[PDB]
Design a protein around this ligand. Sequence first.
Ligand SMILES: [Mn+2]
Ligand SMILES: [Mn+2]
Length: 177
Amino acid sequence: SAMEDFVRQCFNPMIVELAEKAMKEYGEDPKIETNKFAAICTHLEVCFMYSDFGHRFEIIEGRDRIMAWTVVNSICNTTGVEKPKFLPDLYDYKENRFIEIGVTRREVHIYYLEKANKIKSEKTHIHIFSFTGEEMATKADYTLDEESRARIKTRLFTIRQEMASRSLWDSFRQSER
Ligand SMILES: [Mn+2]
Ligand SMILES: [Mn+2]
């Protein structure tokens, strides 16, 4: 598929490898679930950019479940912050709170409501990004400075435009995988 080629050309090999590992966890094949492949790569890249724009942030996404829960447990033991139900994406040492990052091809408020209804934890901060430069965060607290968020928005829009140039955007956005 052209989607796999695009993924291997636009994403660095480490992100592609982690995404393939996550698909093995899912028991899914990157050559069949190509849109899920692109979405997982995009979410990983956004989480890594978010963490690098700070060390203010502890990365939880991208680790295997053992190490992710080990990191979450150590953070909870040191800070006393409540342990989340689901594995979040980041921990913010400055605000002392876990962060769930969302990347959606739909409207940001719809996805925000979906994520907030899932996580059921007022403590965990939510930050949603779209491929159109829109964002939505808990209490309108965007955590990052405007420059870092602009970098993330530019990266997402560029991914959307590369997909559209390769005639892949319609399939990707119409899919919720
Ligand atoms: Mn995650
Ligand atoms: Mn996430």
